[PDB]
Design a protein around this ligand. Structure first.
Ligand SMILES: N=C(N)c1ccc(-c2ccccc2)s1
Ligand SMILES: N=C(N)c1ccc(-c2ccccc2)s1
Ligand SMILES: [Ca+2]
Ligand SMILES: [Ca+2]
Ligand SMILES: [Mg+2]
Ligand SMILES: [Mg+2]
Ligand SMILES: [Mg+2]
Ligand SMILES: [Mg+2]
Lengths: 12, 227, 227, 12
């Protein structure tokens, strides 16, 4: 899946 | 819990060590134990709590998506069983964080910076539940409700460059885009948030400017993909 | 164990899914459950077992070194306590793998490819114990003993390009260099292993050539740092 | 610590 930017650690 | 016999200050010190060691499950357990001491959290401690659980749930979300993708391609029981095992663990981590916020972080949080932080977290963890939900409408409404209360407080109490306010709007915009199936709302929120922050940057120190523009670049990154 | 009610074939299928999801603790638990069915493992299954535990113990070793470094710099009890917590967990994973090899993978392994694989693993997991040991001499001797038995079989039964033989020699050379404090033995072993493999490459297919030269590049990488 | 090359996943 294309994941969009969310706040904090990009841990996924 | 298992952390009941450890000093609060020792749990916080070990959360910081666990972060340095990339031991995020330990970091989250130490921060859960700190919260359960029943004292309010400082700004630094709220950030340790959020980083710990964000790292734990992020591994689970990444694993869930890999398994769901395999499962969807496949359509024996093993892919479904294993995707369900990972889903149940993810749901448990979300319920644990929601339990800490409800017992009793939110009700004791009176300052905007703490209150908006925790309500943003409540929206985020309902959003993670919504990502795996097939109950789903009520879970989406819980996320929306938490985000909206955090937005109302942030708009009244915080400048438009406040990084907590910016991170909230970022996450609420992604909620709109891919959970609420409201891409136009997502784009409107990301644009208004960016433009109102842009106009307040002149008020900031160099260090505050760096903190605000880092999150504004995330809103722009999403807007670039969405338009 | 908790995997006693799952089919062997289902545990292997889920180990493969867990690898794709980067869920190495789950991958290791599924492979432990497969081993405890009591049947010998295939080449693929031995590789799943080794990849799973290598990933788990590698996180622990990386965390242990970060904590030990902080502890050494610091010279309250919290750094020592937390380094000890991670050390104990690492020791437990090593004892679990050593327990599977002793009950009963090694004693049933009659083919060189399986026997050398498991004895190499036994040396590797005693080596990980030695890295945190301060008992230490007997742990080092256990690692040496396992590596030496694996080397004697590999030299009699496998060509010098065999990737299991190469990986064994690589790991035994690092054992010598930094556990046994025998850097000259480490360098001699890495050089002889590389040179004897080089001379046998002409016998290989393109695919076997790629497998052998990948490990030979690791021996060269170490030799470059050691000389 | 400088870690030397060992076999398999470089997981540390
Ligand atoms: N990842 C982490 N350890 C932190 C994030 C934010 C922190 C902070 C420090 C001082 C004041 C307010 C926040 S610490
Ligand atoms: N990481 C993994 N899943 C594997 C490593 C080696 C494998 C193998 C496959 C067929 C035959 C012999 C070995 S599978
Ligand atoms: Ca399962
Ligand atoms: Ca501890
Ligand atoms: Mg992400
Ligand atoms: Mg379910
Ligand atoms: Mg100890
Ligand atoms: Mg390494």
């Amino acid at each position: 899946k294309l994941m969009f930017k969310t706040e904090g650690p990009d841990s996924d | 819990g298992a952390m009941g016999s450890m000093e609060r200050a020792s749990l916080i010190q070990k959360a910081k060590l666990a972060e340095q060691a990339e031991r995020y499950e330990d970091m989250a357990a130490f921060m859960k134990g700190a919260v359960e001491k029943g004292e309010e959290l400082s700004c630094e401690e709220r950030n340790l709590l959020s980083v710990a659980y964000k790292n734990v749930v992020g591994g689970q979300r990444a694993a869930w998506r890999v398994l769901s993708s395999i499962e969807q391609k496949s359509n024996g029981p093993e892919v479904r069983e294993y995707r369900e095992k990972v889903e149940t663990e993810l749901q448990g981590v979300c319920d644990t964080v929601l339990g800490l916020l409800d017992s009793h972080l939110i009700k004791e949080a009176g300052d905007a910076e703490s209150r908006v932080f925790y309500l943003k977290m409540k929206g985020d963890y309902y959003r993670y539940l919504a990502e795996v939900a097939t109950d789903k409408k009520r879970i989406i409404d819980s996320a929306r409700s938490a985000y909206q209360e955090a937005m109302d407080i942030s708009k009244k109490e915080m400048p438009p460059t406040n990084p907590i306010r910016l991170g909230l709007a970022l996450n609420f915009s992604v909620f709109h885009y891919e959970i609420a199936n409201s891409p136009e709302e997502a784009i409107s929120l990301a644009k208004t948030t960016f433009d109102e922050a842009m106009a307040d940057l002149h008020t900031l120190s160099e260090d505050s400017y760096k903190d605000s523009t880092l999150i504004m670049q995330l809103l722009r990154d999403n807007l670039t993909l969405w338009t």
